[PDB]
Design an enzyme around this catalytic site. Structure first.
Site, PDB file in Angstrom:
ATOM      1  CD  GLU A  35      39.564  11.094  -0.036  1.00 62.04           C
ATOM      2  OE1 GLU A  35      40.186  11.515  -0.804  1.00 62.04           O
ATOM      3  OE2 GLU A  35      40.283  12.001   1.027  1.00 62.04           O
ATOM      4  CG  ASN A  46      46.195  13.891  -7.074  1.00 65.74           C
ATOM      5  OD1 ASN A  46      47.026  12.654  -6.254  1.00 65.74           O
ATOM      6  ND2 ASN A  46      45.182  14.441  -7.015  1.00 65.74           N
ATOM      7  CG  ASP A  48      51.159  15.520  -6.456  1.00 65.59           C
ATOM      8  OD1 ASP A  48      50.785  14.776  -7.300  1.00 65.59           O
ATOM      9  OD2 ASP A  48      52.001  15.305  -5.652  1.00 65.59           O
ATOM     10  CB  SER A  50      51.054  10.899  -7.104  1.00 68.09           C
ATOM     11  OG  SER A  50      49.798  12.617  -6.483  1.00 68.09           O
ATOM     12  CG  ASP A  52      44.910  10.270  -4.142  1.00 68.77           C
ATOM     13  OD1 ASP A  52      46.089  10.279  -4.232  1.00 68.77           O
ATOM     14  OD2 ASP A  52      43.911  11.428  -4.506  1.00 68.77           O
ATOM     15  CG  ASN A  59      49.555  10.360  -3.064  1.00 71.71           C
ATOM     16  OD1 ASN A  59      50.694  10.426  -2.862  1.00 71.71           O
ATOM     17  ND2 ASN A  59      48.669  11.137  -4.112  1.00 71.71           N
TER      18      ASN A  59
END
Length: 129
Positions: A35, A46, A48, A50, A52, A59
């Protein structure tokens, strides 16, 4: 901070990830490497809107609020910028909330698509953990 392999394994074990609700230590080390590349300062935008955050790429639509994500659920009751720290305590505590609240480790893209099914003990090989 960027962790070493046994270094991160020891820090996660001493924060209670030896076997948290059926997920042994090797799963957590595997997820952190895929990750964030063991990097506590890792971030990722991301598609959308959002983002991380941190060693476990938590998230911002579901688990933390960064003030930049419309409709953040903030289920870990924490600002996302607090997860960018050299100490992993806040990320571990939010990870425990994540696996408890219906997700298991399936919440992590890297765990369900890469770590699951592998020899996860290879991640803690030789660490005496």
């Amino acid at each position: 901070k960027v962790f070493g392999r046994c270094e991160l394994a020891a820090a996660m074990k001493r924060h209670g990830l030896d076997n948290y609700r059926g997920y042994s230590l090797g799963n957590w080390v595997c997820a952190a490497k895929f990750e964030s590349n063991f990097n506590t300062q890792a971030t990722n935008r991301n598609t959308d809107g959002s983002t991380d955050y941190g060693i476990l790429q938590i998230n911002s639509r579901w688990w933390c609020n960064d003030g930049r994500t419309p409709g953040s659920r903030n289920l870990c009751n924490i600002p996302c910028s607090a997860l960018l720290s050299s100490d992993i305590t806040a990320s571990v505590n939010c990870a425990k909330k994540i696996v408890s609240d219906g997700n298991g480790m399936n919440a992590w893209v890297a765990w369900r698509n890469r770590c699951k099914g592998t020899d996860v003990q290879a991640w803690i090989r030789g660490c005496r953990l």
